[PDB]
Enzyme design. Sequence first.
Site, short mmCIF file in Angstrom:
data_model
loop_
_atom_site.label_atom_id
_atom_site.label_comp_id
_atom_site.label_asym_id
_atom_site.label_seq_id
_atom_site.Cartn_x
_atom_site.Cartn_y
_atom_site.Cartn_z
CG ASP A 36 -1.99 1.05 1.22
OD1 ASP A 36 -2.20 1.70 0.17
OD2 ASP A 36 -2.65 1.25 2.27
CG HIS A 95 -8.98 -0.74 -4.01
ND1 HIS A 95 -10.05 -0.27 -3.29
CD2 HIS A 95 -7.89 -0.07 -3.54
CE1 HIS A 95 -9.64 0.64 -2.42
NE2 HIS A 95 -8.32 0.76 -2.54
#
Length: 438
Positions: A167, A304
């Site tokens: 991330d 996403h």
Amino acid sequence: ILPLNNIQGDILVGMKKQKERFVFFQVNDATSFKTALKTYVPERITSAAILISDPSQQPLAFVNLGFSNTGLQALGITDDLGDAQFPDGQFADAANLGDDLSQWVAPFTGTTIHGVFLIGSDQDDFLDQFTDDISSTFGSSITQVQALSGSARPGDQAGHEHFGFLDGISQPSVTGWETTVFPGQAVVPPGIILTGRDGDTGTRPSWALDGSFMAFRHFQQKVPEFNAYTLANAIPANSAGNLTQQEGAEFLGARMFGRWKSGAPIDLAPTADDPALGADPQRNNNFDYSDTLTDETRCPFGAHVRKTNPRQDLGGPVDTFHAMRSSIPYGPETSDAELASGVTAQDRGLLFVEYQSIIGNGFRFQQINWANNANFPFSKPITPGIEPIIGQTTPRTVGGLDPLNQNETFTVPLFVIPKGGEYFFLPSISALTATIAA
Ligand code: HEM
Ligand SMILES: O=C1O[C@H]([C@@H](O)CO)C(O)=C1O
């Protein structure tokens, strides 16, 4: 030219620390709070300039500070900041985001929270010392209503969130300062992030210059459940050939995110992980979906990253909907016994932080207009469906996850549970003392 010494560092640069604590507070005594603020700010509030300096010139912990609408009101700071969602707070907006309100918890279930101190440090000791320093400095002028503490995951999982995915790869780059821009990175005017700067169309008080709005979200993640789902729905094959179940489960996770766990984007690595690509910032962001606008072999429409940053799905570069993120995981690792059972036994998740000048164009647009919207991205040959990670529309049906059977739909259990959140405004450093503490 952006005054880097005057901009709270988490907004523009990101603390990027191994530990982070969010201390949510209410103001008990406005006058005493302001008095403490005037000595606290010059000593502790960390600018973007400090964050880009050599580590030898950095303090042992960084501190930033934001206020909710009720916090500003409690301090007699009454000018309208120009944002549509900030005044009412996030609890009043949660149903709009698609949240199950029954999962929200105190102290977020209202507007009792007046602000948040964010403390970042690379170890617990220093984090605690700087937290104690806030308690000591402000004393009875505040009440701490909650502290949420996060930590980077251990070893080679450093920088990965709890589902296992790297991330913090893709962020916009703003003009107005000297910085490195990676291939594929969006370049936007600074007012996409900083209130009162070029690109910001909101009506701001002069004192709001170089602030930003934070959307904070406390997410609990269901990791054994996510893992079990990928195994139960493992993709049998892709273009390269048949997959073992383990391969097909890993691939399904990558199809849901739009990146492999290594950070390799599936648009570049559509059939197998490329960990060296994932680790290379010169390559890992160099894609725009232009090679897959009207098919899902390379990437599903509803993955996403594609839902939250559509890139060429919008027809070209668009400044308006980019936002900075500075999220951190929290909670213990998932044991082998938890993974085997397929059932969450411990509290873990993401302390999510997104900055933008206009809440409705950043976080909230990505959530509602894009992730929650079954028919976004627009004008596709197969319905994209609901973003499988954070989309909140039921049924949570997403198409195209199997590249060899793109009309097959997947109904995905919710693995990310909103437990609370708030909208904050982070003023400039000068504003903290010249306006907030005046
Ligand atoms: C627990 C919840 C979440 C998890 C586990 C998660 C995880 C990730 C991961 C692994 C990436 C890829 C790394 C990267 O491109 O930087 C990513 C990217 C991103 N996420 Fe999330 N995310 C979560 C919630 C959200 C939410 C709620 C939003 C906004 C509504 C959001 C917006 C974004 C954006 C804008 C990107 C960068 C996309 C790009 O520029 O290509 N994320 N997220
Ligand atoms: O993030 C993005 O990257 C491309 C382009 O801006 C890269 O230069 C695009 O259209 C986005 O929305």
